Amino acid sequence: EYELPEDPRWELPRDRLVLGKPLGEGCFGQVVLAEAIGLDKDKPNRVTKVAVKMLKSDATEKDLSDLISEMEMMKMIGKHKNIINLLGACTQDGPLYVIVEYASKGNLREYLQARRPPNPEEQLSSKDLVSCAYQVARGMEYLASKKCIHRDLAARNVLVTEDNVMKIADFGLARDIHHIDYYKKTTNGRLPVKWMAPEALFDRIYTHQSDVWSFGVLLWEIFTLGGSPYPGVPVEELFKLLKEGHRMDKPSNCTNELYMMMRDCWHAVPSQRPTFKQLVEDLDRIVALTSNQ
Ligand SMILES: */C=C/C(=O)Nc1ccc(CCN2C(=O)N(c3cc(OC)cc(OC)c3)Cc3cnc(Nc4ccccc4NC(=O)C=C)nc32)cc1
Numbered sequence: 001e002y003e004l005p006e007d008p009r010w011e012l013p014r015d016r017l018v019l020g021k022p023l024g025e026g027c028f029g030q031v032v033l034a035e036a037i038g039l040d041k042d043k044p045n046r047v048t049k050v051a052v053k054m055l056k057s058d059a060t061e062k063d064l065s066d067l068i069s070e071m072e073m074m075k076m077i078g079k080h081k082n083i084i085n086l087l088g089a090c091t092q093d094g095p096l097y098v099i100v101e102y103a104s105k106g107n108l109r110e111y112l113q114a115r116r117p118p119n120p121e122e123q124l125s126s127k128d129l130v131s132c133a134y135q136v137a138r139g140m141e142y143l144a145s146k147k148c149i150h151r152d153l154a155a156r157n158v159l160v161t162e163d164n165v166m167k168i169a170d171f172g173l174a175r176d177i178h179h180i181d182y183y184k185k186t187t188n189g190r191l192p193v194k195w196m197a198p199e200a201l202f203d204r205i206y207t208h209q210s211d212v213w214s215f216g217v218l219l220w221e222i223f224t225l226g227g228s229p230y231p232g233v234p235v236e237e238l239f240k241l242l243k244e245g246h247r248m249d250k251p252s253n254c255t256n257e258l259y260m261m262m263r264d265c266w267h268a269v270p271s272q273r274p275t276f277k278q279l280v281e282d283l284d285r286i287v288a289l290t291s292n293q
Pocket residue numbers: 022023024025026027028031033051053070071084098100101102103104105106107159168169170171172187
């Protein structure tokens with residue numbers, strides 16, 4: 001069924017997309033790099049590198065509605081500098097193509113890891129790392145204001161552009177039924193359950209406050225330069241640690257102020273955690289006062 005309603009403000013003719021090859025290492029080949037010709041109505045002789053999400057070969061009738069929902073969700077949420085933005089779509093005369101912004105330097109976890117000290121790439125200053133935190137906070141603040149709750153806020157779901165702009169991804173998905181499946185690992189072999197707030201983990205309660213918990217874990221990821229939370233800790237033992245009120249240790253190069261921020265994000269009482277608005281304001285002040293040397 002490739003008869004879909006057309007929204008002309010977002011529509012791009014298929015012969016304006018030059019489809020490249022799958023992004024990342026290449027497992028999720030449903031999303032590919034591509035070149036859009038004349039994406040903007042102003043001078044259509046300009047090419048723009050973009051990312052294109054399409055349906056797999058064995059697409060179910062609901063995987064279709066899944067992608068469509070994600071697309072409509074992004075339309076409603078609107079645009080921000082620090083999220084992966086919708087750019088257009090191909091809905092008529094062929095398979096559904098959803099066109100979004102492209103991130104050349106990969107996810108934040110990869111980005112950070114590839115810039116650790118020992119052909120090096122780059123070394124991030126202290127101001128750089130706090131700046132990363134600020135950008136993600138600013139993105140999450142916008143998403144929160146649009147009543148959007150992220151399902152898995154983590155470094156893996158933050159993407160980095162050519163200009164080193166942090167962009168939040170996968171914020172337009174739906175709460176998968178119930179069965180979250182706590183033992184399922186990511187492609188890098190980590191347990192996403194270690195980013196989950198306790199109330200979301202034990203009572204299945206998801207609020208903006210649970211995202212702040214996740215941002216805390218993300219902050220820890222940033223200042224450990226892509227470090228893995230709770231190495232060697234299975235799901236069962238994580239639960240025990242959480243019930244006992246255990247918290248991750250302070251990263252080595254991390255200032256006490258920033259570690260306090262993490263701990264505040266990890267408050268046992270959800271109402272006592274800071275808001276993303278607070279976090280943006282604080283991180284703004286810290287960047288200004290953080291050394292570039
Ligand atoms: C086993 C495969 C593996 O290693 N993982 C893997 C993870 C993600 C991706 C593509 C990620 N991606 C993406 O999904 N984008 C996107 C698309 C939609 O469609 C609605 C919505 C989004 O948010 C709501 C986000 C856009 C996008 C843009 N740029 C990248 N680039 C990238 C990410 C991670 C690693 C490497 C790259 N770039 C390259 O590979 C370029 C050389 N990714 C996405 C693929 C694999």
